[PDB]
From a paper:
The bacterial member [name] is part of the phage shock protein (psp) response that maintains structural integrity of membranes under stress conditions such as temperature and infection. The main effector of the Psp system is [name], a 25 kDa protein consisting of six α-helices connected by short loops and an elongated hairpin, where the N-terminal helix α0 of the protein remains unfolded in the absence of membranes. Interestingly, [name] is related to eukaryotic and archaeal endosomal sorting complexes required for transport ([name])-III proteins and has a similar structure. Here, we show that rods of bacterial [name]-III protein [name] internalize and thin membrane tubules by overcoming the required bending energy through progressive membrane binding of the N-terminal helix in the [name] assembly.
For our analyses, we refolded [name] in the presence of 50 nm sized small unilamellar [name] vesicles, similar to a recently described protocol. In the presence of [name] membranes, the rods had a wider diameter and a broader diameter distribution (200 to 345 Å) in comparison with the diameter values and distribution of the previously analyzed apo protein (180 to 290 Å). By segmenting the rods of the [name]-[name] sample and sorting the segments according to diameter through classification, we determined a total of 10 cryo-EM structures with resolutions ranging from 4.7 to 6.5 Å. While the imposed helical symmetry parameters suggested no architectural relationship between the [name] rods, helical lattice plots revealed that the left-handed helical rung corresponding to layer line ~110 Å in the power spectrum increased in Bessel order from n = 10, 11, 12…18 with increasing diameters of 200, 215, 235…345 Å, respectively. Upon insertion of an additional subunit into the helical rung, the assembly widens in discrete steps of around 20 Å up to a diameter of 345 Å. The rods with diameters larger than 280 Å were of particular interest as they showed enclosed double-layered lipid density in the cross-sectional top and side views in addition to the expected [name] protein densities, whereas rods of 270 Å diameter contained only partial lipid density and smaller diameters showed no density in the cross-section views. When comparing them with the previous apo structures, we observed that the structures of the [name] sample were identical to the apo structures with the same diameters, including their respective helical symmetry. The cryo-EM structures and MD simulations showed that only rods wider than 270 Å internalize and tubulate membranes. As indicated in the simulations, the energy required for membrane bending likely is too high for thinner rods to bend and internalize membrane tubules.
Residue numbers in the entry:
A (entry chain J): 77 to 125
B (entry chain I): 22 to 174
C (entry chain H): 126 to 217
D (entry chain p), E (entry chain G): 175 to 217
Amino acid sequence: AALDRGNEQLAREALGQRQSYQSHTEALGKSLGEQRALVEQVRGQLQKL
Amino acid sequence: QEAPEDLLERLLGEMELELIELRRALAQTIATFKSTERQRDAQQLIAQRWYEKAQAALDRGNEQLAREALGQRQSYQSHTEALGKSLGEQRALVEQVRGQLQKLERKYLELKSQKNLYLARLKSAIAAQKIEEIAGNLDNASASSLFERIETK
Amino acid sequence: ERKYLELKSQKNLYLARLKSAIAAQKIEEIAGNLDNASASSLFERIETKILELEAERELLNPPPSPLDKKFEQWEEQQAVEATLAAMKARRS
Amino acid sequence: ILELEAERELLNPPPSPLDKKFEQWEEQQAVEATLAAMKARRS
Amino acid sequence: ILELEAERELLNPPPSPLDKKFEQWEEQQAVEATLAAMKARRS
């Protein structure tokens, strides 16, 4: 709708708005991955005990 | 310096009260920043009123009073300029302060996200440091394990 | 009085900035940046210490030798293949 | 009383000034759209 | 207050002035890329 109504200037503003979240998604897009492989290692230790 | 894990838990506790203390202080500037801003308008308002009367000062053939009226406002004219720039300086400063605060909260939560993820690993080793000591492995027969001490006695 | 109020107007505006730095002086010290790995950050001290205990288990009672895994992995193939080998004949 | 006003405006920030445009700029489409079909629907 | 500002800027140095270019110079590609496909995607 930003560009559909001949308001592409707003679309650029809209497009730049999301980039803030794009970095945030990537920022937290990898923190989860690191935790995932770590806990499963912790799980293995507990079962043996 | 207590145990590294013990200090961390306490350290984060005092961090929470820190931000909210900073939370209150920043709000004070916003209130005062507005209060002075409003104060300026009222001060500018009253001074503007005097100029309005200047029409009647000269309308009734009393221009001598108009000069007195005109000189009266000049006192407020300087005052308006005096406070006309103090607000401008404060405006650009607080917004910089605002930027700093947001990162701390965003930073603060992410640090805490991994706080417990290490505590469990820490307690994995401590439990994974005792069982062997109690019994050990029969291949070596250390005899330091309390279990062996039972056998020898 | 005119001077007094204006001075006070800026009193708090500096206190918030002052408390910005003190809070902006601790977070890095607690954790720092992973690129440098200062190890002065309390967070790193946790990482190094946990490693030390890992050595005790791996050293006081050594884990199975790397060969030991082969002797058990190389033979499990015989076990799994043996059971299915008889399974095919047993099925027939 | 002003101090508390900041907490609401800061602790949970209000919608951005742009956000009002994204909703005000589109409500015109909604109101105009319904009446646009209304005229044709009437006919 | 200035003295503490140095610690953050020095103990953990901020991104290099170049680093801003590497991220600013590429964001233009990102923003232009999405709208470039948007025009074709719209058509």
